[PDB]
Chains A and B, each alone.
Chain A
Amino acid sequence: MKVRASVKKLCRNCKIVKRDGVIRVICSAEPKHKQRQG
């Protein structure tokens, strides 16, 4: 995962939302793809 300041694009299967100021990313089908800050 890592703490990150880049969100970019990395996997087309990701679902993105801005939550409590930061960008959150979760991926249903492709493995390990996740983000908790951005």
Chain B
Amino acid sequence: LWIARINAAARQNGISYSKFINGLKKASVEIDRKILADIAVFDKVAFTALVEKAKAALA
């Protein structure tokens, strides 16, 4: 159910959900879980600043 606002926001920043979430897994030790991805509901820039970070961290 939460995926509906997550994948639709990665797909608007030039990255797939499966690469976005694994970029946050390549970041090492830092917290990222699917229930904690709701920051976009209050402010969409808070998620944009995390997707641009995941893109940099993925490689």
Q: Please say whether the chains A and B touch (CB closer than 8 A).
A: no
Interface residues of B (CB under 8 A from A): none
Using CB atoms and an 8 Å cutoff, list the residues of chain A in contact with chain B: none
